[PDB]
Amino acid sequence: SLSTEATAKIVSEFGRDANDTGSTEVQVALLTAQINHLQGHFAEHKKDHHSRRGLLRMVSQRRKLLDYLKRKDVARYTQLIERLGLRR
Amino acid sequence: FCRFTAEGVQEIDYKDIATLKNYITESGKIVPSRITGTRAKYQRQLARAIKRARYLSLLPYTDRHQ
Amino acid sequence: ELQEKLIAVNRVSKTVKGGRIFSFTALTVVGDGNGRVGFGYGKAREVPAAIQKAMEKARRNMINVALNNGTLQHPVKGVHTGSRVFMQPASEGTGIIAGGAMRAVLEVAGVHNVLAKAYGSTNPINVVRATIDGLENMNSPEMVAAKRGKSVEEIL
């Protein structure tokens, strides 16, 4: 999993209040970081299918979040995707 | 009638050999949780400890072996 | 005063060491031409005896049915085992439009005017039972009023 400190850092940056944590953008960021982390793992361990399932799920969740953001508020979404470097 | 619930131990210790020895057979085998009446959660831990001990030659795997 | 109709009589067998022992089942239904109906299912080695038994059974454990004039009070479904039955109240003159066992029960009950289809199974015994159930459940306007805490004119 993502280390506590790292998570906190992520929250602080993206979250407006820094105590917020549940902001859509923040959540997305958290997901994204985790995904990035797991890439390294999965390069090594290609047959770790069970673990990869979780990763996939996370990705899906992130996508959903992004979609939600888009309909609600476009500018914010755009900003987020610039920050994280998500192609979509 | 579990011992570890009453003592209130956080984790069973493989080093605590004497304690282990009560839960092991004359033939070396780990004694069932029916007989000892150990709680399930603790029982597993105990087993693990015993195994560890066996690896460290603190407890024997069996009576015959040498 | 009571009218009684033997719906069906069926020969049923029991296999024994020797061979087959045969017997007869009689399904009857009785009614007073008003609300009261009762079916009876009797069994014996000979037919007439069986029929008699059935009749006897019928005569006890009768059941009352609220009848608005010659017909039913509203469309009513009744089910029992395979036989599921629909019966619908109908205008004076139309007669009992219903099939088989179902018809007989209606006739004794003193419904004169119905539109009634038996869906599913048409196994006489089951279908008569279903019909009876339907009749039984069927509530009157007065009854409904009583239930709801209203007058009959409030319900219409």
Partner: protein, 129 residues
């Protein structure tokens, strides 16, 4: 997921009737409340009571006459999967007039008879008998 609240409410009511429960509670909604009111008017329930500010709970008080339940039958007709709208001439008669059909019309939710009287049809919510 929860897709049909009215339907759920109806189901709850039915279950209460079955199980000889005195009162049946659920999360409140305006439509639901209206329905409850209608039922009360038509005399299928004793009383309804909404309670709460943030997340209010509608509590119906079920009725029992001579042991058995009052609400003999209660079905949704319109449902999210397949909506039913009737014109004032096409409005039904539940149990040949002895039961009622809750119908939502432009002039609020009402019984079928009421709607007919008014001279307007609408979305048929539920039959109650």
């Amino acid at each position: 997921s929860m897709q049909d609240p009215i339907a759920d409410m109806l189901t709850r009511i039915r279950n209460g009737q079955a199980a000889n429960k005195a009162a049946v509670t659920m999360p409140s909604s305006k439509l639901k409340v209206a329905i409850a009111n209608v039922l009360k008017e038509e005399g299928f329930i004793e009383d309804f009571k909404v309670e709460g500010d943030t997340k209010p709970e509608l509590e119906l008080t079920l009725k029992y006459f001579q042991g058995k339940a009052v609400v003999e039958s209660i079905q949704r007709v319109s449902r999210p999967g397949l909506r039913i709208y009737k014109r004032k001439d096409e409005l039904p008669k539940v149990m040949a007039g002895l039961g009622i059909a809750v119908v939502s019309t432009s002039k609020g939710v009402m019984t079928d008879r009421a709607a007919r009287q008014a001279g307007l049809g609408g979305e048929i919510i539920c039959y109650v008998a």
